[PDB]
Amino acid sequence: HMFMAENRLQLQKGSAEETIERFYNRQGIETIEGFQQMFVTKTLNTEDTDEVKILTIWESEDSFNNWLNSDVFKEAHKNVRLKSDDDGQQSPILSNKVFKYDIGYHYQK
């Protein structure tokens, strides 16, 4: 079975679009053996905080862990700040939460 890891970003209202633009060019995730796909989504119809989800699809959980442990993961996140960080005041990113999934079925037309 494939594996999915989600990073769920809790953002200030209206900041989804500027946040998504940060994901346009790859920073090495694609070099990890077992990486397959990524989607970056904006949750529609939110009334409070904006929500952006980063969905990554892998041949296995092991592949994902390999990326978490990689230098490219660190490089991609080096200038990322939460609003709570000492130098993070201007960041619209409030928090993140990671979700993990077994992919029990996939179909493509």
Residues that bind ligand HEM (CB under 6 A): 5, 7, 22-23, 26-29, 38, 54, 56, 72, 76-77, 79-80, 82, 93, 96, 98
In the complex, the smallest distance separating the C-beta of residue 85 from its own copies, rounded to whole angstroms, is 24
In total, the chain counts a number of residues equal to 109
- 86 contacts which partner out of its own copies, ligand HEM, none, CB within 5 to 8 A by kind? none
**Both tokens of residue 20?**
């998504």
- 98 contacts which partner out of ligand HEM, its own copies, none, CB within 5 to 8 A by kind? ligand HEM
**Helix (H, G, I), strand (E, B), or coil: what is residue 48?**
coil
Q: Note whether 40 binds its own copies by CB under 8 A.
A: yes
**Both tokens of residue 28?**
């090495």
The gap from C-alpha 14 to its chain's centroid, in whole angstroms, comes to 18
| Of 13, 1, 7, 31, nearest in space to 80 by CA | 7
Q: Note whether 73 binds its own copies by CB under 8 A.
A: no
Q: Note whether 4 binds its own copies by CB under 8 A.
A: yes
